[PDB]
Amino acid sequence: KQQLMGSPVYIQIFKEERTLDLYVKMGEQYQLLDSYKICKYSGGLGPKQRGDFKSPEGYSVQRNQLKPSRYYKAINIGFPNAYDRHYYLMIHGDCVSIGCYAMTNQGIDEIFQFVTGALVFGQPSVQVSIYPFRMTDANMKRKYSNFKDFEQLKPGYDYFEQTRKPPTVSNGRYVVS
Amino acid sequence: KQQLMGSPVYIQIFKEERTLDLYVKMGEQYQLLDSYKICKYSGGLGPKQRQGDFKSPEGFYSVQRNQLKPDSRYYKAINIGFPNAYDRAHGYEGKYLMIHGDCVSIGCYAMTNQGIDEIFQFVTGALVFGQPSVQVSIYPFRMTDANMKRHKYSNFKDFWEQLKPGYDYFEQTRKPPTVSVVNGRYVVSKPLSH
């Protein structure tokens, strides 16, 4: 039973693996709640910059979950972030969109509830880590991409797999603790 | 389409009709969102008063973050917050009185799991965006003079006569009743001459 509603919560997206892992604060470390199949993204691998048809990589929420008219239960990633600002991108259910990440409707239901849950009870922001792929050096060496340097994200992926804590992130380049 | 999430919300329960109506603010007045079957309550008709009472409450209540999970027992419990101002004024005891999903309970209104899902999200929605309380009017039955007559000679005529004005205000204005306890009695406000 998820009697864990409204506890803080954190998300990791993996574009290539087409999945979203959703974790929940249990005492002093986040443990996997469930994880959900990404039906559609667009522009394949790489982050957003311009008419670009890419889905973003790199985000907090708060109350940008007001629905729009186009989408079902859209969670606004809040692009452009501080980094993006070098450039209505959403997580939502089965719909056809320009950039956004498209889940099953069952999946968004489950997600959206847990987020709003966490929000209701404290939880200033819910952070969301969007990666192009699982960042094991295996995949990382699978290089020579225009995006290779944007290696800025590995530390993030790494931090979490090691500590199970959302990374503390911030000159035109992401840095963590 | 439920693009109306996070709009203010109001609930009315009807014990006798075994249903919960859930309304949502559309501009100046609430419009029925959907309404849901109550699988199980207990003790049948009338408000809750002693611990042993197998009674489910009746009255006007507020919800805030009374969605803390005691899910230890129930699924998606919204605590009605009994005892209220009225209840306390008569020195009634209870706790843990709930609107919740398909679980087995003593003083609580039990919806289907599908039903509670829809409710609970709309509530948390509303509270996320402002909305200090969700008001929750729990009635023994739809309070038409027809029903009020079927139920003269009840111990609770007086009590229920205190609720009718609330039920009435809403079918009339489609705004949550401004209610308050005066001397152990609910009084339903209603504007003056201007």
Side-chain angles (χ1 to χ4, degrees):
Chain A
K1 358 276 189 181
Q2 309 136 318
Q3 335 171 306
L4 307 169
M5 196 138 325
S7 300
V9 60
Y10 188 50
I11 286 156
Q12 307 249 101
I13 292 181
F14 300 146
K15 291 176 75 173
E16 191 181 58
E17 290 77 8
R18 285 188 170 252
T19 64
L20 187 159
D21 286 355
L22 174 62
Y23 305 85
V24 170
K25 180 149 217 43
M26 277 178 76
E28 215 53 38
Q29 65 283 67
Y30 294 41
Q31 176 58 286
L32 185 73
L33 188 88
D34 276 309
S35 62
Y36 303 104
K37 272 44 207 183
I38 306 178
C39 311
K40 296 192 187 66
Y41 63 100
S42 60
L45 286 286
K48 176 78 154 69
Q49 292 196 8
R50 286 218 267 244
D52 188 359
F53 291 160
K54 279 176 175 306
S55 318
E57 305 176 341
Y59 295 79
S60 279
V61 281
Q62 323 191 311
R63 310 148 41 221
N64 54 13
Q65 51 254 324
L66 2 94
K67 320 194 84 187
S69 34
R70 291 181 302 306
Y71 327 116
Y72 174 72
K73 283 207 180 158
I75 310 164
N76 189 322
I77 289 172
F79 183 99
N81 69 20
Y83 171 101
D84 312 313
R85 285 179 280 139
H86 317 289
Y87 300 167
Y88 296 173
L89 292 174
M90 307 296 195
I91 314 184
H92 69 48
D94 209 59
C95 301
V96 46
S97 52
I98 311 160
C100 311
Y101 297 81
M103 314 301 300
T104 66
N105 299 339
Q106 191 298 305
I108 187 70
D109 290 337
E110 219 190 313
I111 290 170
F112 192 116
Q113 174 76 82
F114 259 96
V115 179
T116 52
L119 259 316
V120 149
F121 293 88
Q123 180 83 311
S125 290
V126 172
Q127 276 188 326
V128 171
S129 309
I130 319 183
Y131 309 103
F133 40 72
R134 276 259 170 79
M135 292 197 168
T136 62
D137 28 10
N139 295 281
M140 282 292 276
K141 292 222 192 210
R142 207 164 46 66
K143 182 174 172 197
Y144 293 123
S145 173
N146 275 228
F147 146 77
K148 182 209 169 217
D149 172 67
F150 192 60
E151 287 223 337
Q152 285 175 63
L153 300 186
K154 174 74 148 62
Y157 175 86
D158 284 347
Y159 188 81
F160 182 77
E161 306 300 313
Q162 284 205 20
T163 67
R164 309 213 152 284
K165 293 247 152 212
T168 311
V169 72
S170 48
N171 284 23
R173 170 171 186 109
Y174 289 142
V175 178
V176 295
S177 325
Chain B
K1 287 139 191 197
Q2 285 42 12
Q3 320 148 313
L4 291 167
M5 189 100 43
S7 314
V9 145
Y10 174 49
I11 287 163
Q12 282 183 343
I13 289 156
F14 296 126
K15 295 173 78 169
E16 200 183 54
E17 289 74 16
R18 273 173 189 253
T19 70
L20 190 159
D21 285 342
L22 169 53
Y23 297 93
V24 61
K25 202 193 227 280
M26 281 168 78
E28 280 299 70
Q29 62 199 316
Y30 301 60
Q31 167 60 256
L32 186 76
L33 187 92
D34 233 305
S35 57
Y36 307 78
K37 296 303 153 265
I38 301 171
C39 304
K40 300 169 174 79
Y41 61 102
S42 86
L45 283 212
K48 163 81 194 165
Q49 289 169 88
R50 297 293 156 235
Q51 289 285 181
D53 260 309
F54 297 78
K55 279 182 181 304
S56 311
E58 297 183 343
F60 312 84
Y61 301 79
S62 286
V63 174
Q64 305 183 332
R65 304 182 305 218
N66 321 163
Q67 12 271 153
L68 336 105
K69 296 296 216 155
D71 279 17
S72 29
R73 295 157 305 173
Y74 323 122
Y75 170 80
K76 289 211 174 80
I78 308 170
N79 187 322
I80 288 163
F82 181 98
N84 70 20
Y86 178 98
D87 312 312
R88 288 204 297 294
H90 297 284
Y92 301 153
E93 341 93 344
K95 55 264 180 59
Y96 305 139
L97 297 170
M98 303 296 195
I99 315 176
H100 69 50
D102 191 18
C103 305
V104 140
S105 54
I106 33 201
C108 307
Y109 303 93
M111 321 301 282
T112 58
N113 295 345
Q114 193 294 307
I116 189 70
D117 292 326
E118 220 194 301
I119 292 169
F120 196 87
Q121 182 70 283
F122 259 98
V123 172
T124 58
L127 291 153
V128 155
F129 296 95
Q131 176 96 126
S133 275
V134 181
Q135 298 195 315
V136 176
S137 303
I138 311 179
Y139 301 112
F141 41 75
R142 302 192 186 276
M143 297 209 101
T144 66
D145 37 352
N147 287 282
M148 280 302 259
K149 278 164 172 156
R150 213 204 333 126
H151 279 286
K152 305 161 203 201
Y153 301 122
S154 171
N155 283 349
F156 308 131
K157 224 217 325 101
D158 174 79
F159 177 60
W160 294 338
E161 279 186 2
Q162 288 173 63
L163 311 183
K164 187 198 200 299
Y167 169 92
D168 283 340
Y169 186 92
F170 184 75
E171 286 303 2
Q172 180 142 223
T173 64
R174 269 223 205 104
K175 296 191 270 206
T178 317
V179 53
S180 30
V181 191
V182 155
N183 281 112
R185 308 191 72 73
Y186 298 137
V187 176
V188 150
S189 277
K190 206 63 190 71
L192 282 191
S193 67
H194 58 252

